[PDB]
Amino acid sequence: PSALDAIVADVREDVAAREAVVPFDEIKERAARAPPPRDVLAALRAPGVGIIAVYDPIEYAKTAEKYAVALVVITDEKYHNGSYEDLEKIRSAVDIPVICFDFIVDPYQIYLARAYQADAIVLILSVLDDEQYRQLAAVAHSLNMGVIVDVHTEEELERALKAGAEIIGIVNQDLKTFEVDRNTAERLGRLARERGFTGVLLAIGSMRGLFDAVVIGPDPEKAIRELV
């Protein structure tokens, strides 16, 4: 019995179903031909604590772009549910970068996000081992997309630090036990800085003076929504 195992199985079968109609080689080509990503790193590095808004789609996006530095669009890997087409429509309706947030274990999903014009993706270190992390980050970076590395424990933070992650998001939920530690953000963000980290810290939730941006808002999509 394992909620996290079930989510990973859902994602892997979602990919298998998508591949049967849009094969891996075809999604790679569509991703490579997509228009270049907007720069998520620069939007988050901008002075001040930027708001990252989370997602009628067009109305909310056009409203959100008046004050947010970036937009997060939670997607659904299940077959033929319009979720990736809506990501593209939303991104096309605004002028800020759009983060595609789903549960990525397979390179197919990164090409999929890029093909529908995502500017960045999230990698979750509680889900990924070091070899998977290296592969998936390399895929995203080969398409000039930003990578947000979500961490929840001291050990995950250290992996992100040692790997040289430039954007680290700190999440308060444990994706294996599904327990919430309401003060992880302050604890790990302070620890990140005090260990010498000079990149971008995101909080996925009064930790004043620590974070460059803050995200402002079971099956895989439900689990993502809990993270935000």
Nearest to 143 by CA among 101, 114, 100, 113: 114
What residues have CB less than 8 Å from 17, skipping those under 6 apart?
78, 79
d(CA 102, CA 22): 19
3-state secondary structure string, 103-124? CCCCHHHHHHHHHCCCCEEEEE
CATH number of the CATH domain containing 24 = 3.20.20.70
Nearest to 165 by CA among 188, 148, 177, 190: 148
Amino acid at 108: Y
Q: How far is CA 58 from CA 73, 86, 87, 99, in A?
A: 12, 9, 10, 16
> What are the b/e assignments for 53-83, b being 16+ CB within 10 Å?
bbbeeeeebeebbeebbbbbbbbbbbeeeeb
Q: Token digits for 90?
A: 């939303």
d(CA 79, CA 117): 18
Indicate the Cα dihedral angle 35, 40, 42, 47, nearest 10°. Answer: 140
The DSSP output letter for 164 is T
What residues have CB less than 8 Å from 46, skipping those under 6 apart?
69
Experimental method: X-ray
d(CA 47, CA 37): 21
The length of the chain in residues reads 228
Indicate the Cα dihedral angle 136, 94, 38, 148, nearest 10°. Answer: -40
Contact 112, 86 (CB under 8 A): no
Domain span including residue 195: 3-227
At which residue do the structure tokens 């620590």 appear?
Answer: 210
Inter-helix orientation angle 220-227/3-19, to 10°: 120
> What are the b/e assignments for 27-36, b being 16+ CB within 10 Å?
bbeebeebee
Give the total number of structural domains in the chain: 1
At 80, phi and psi to the nearest 5?
65, 40
Resolution number, Å: 2.0
d(CA 171, CA 224): 11
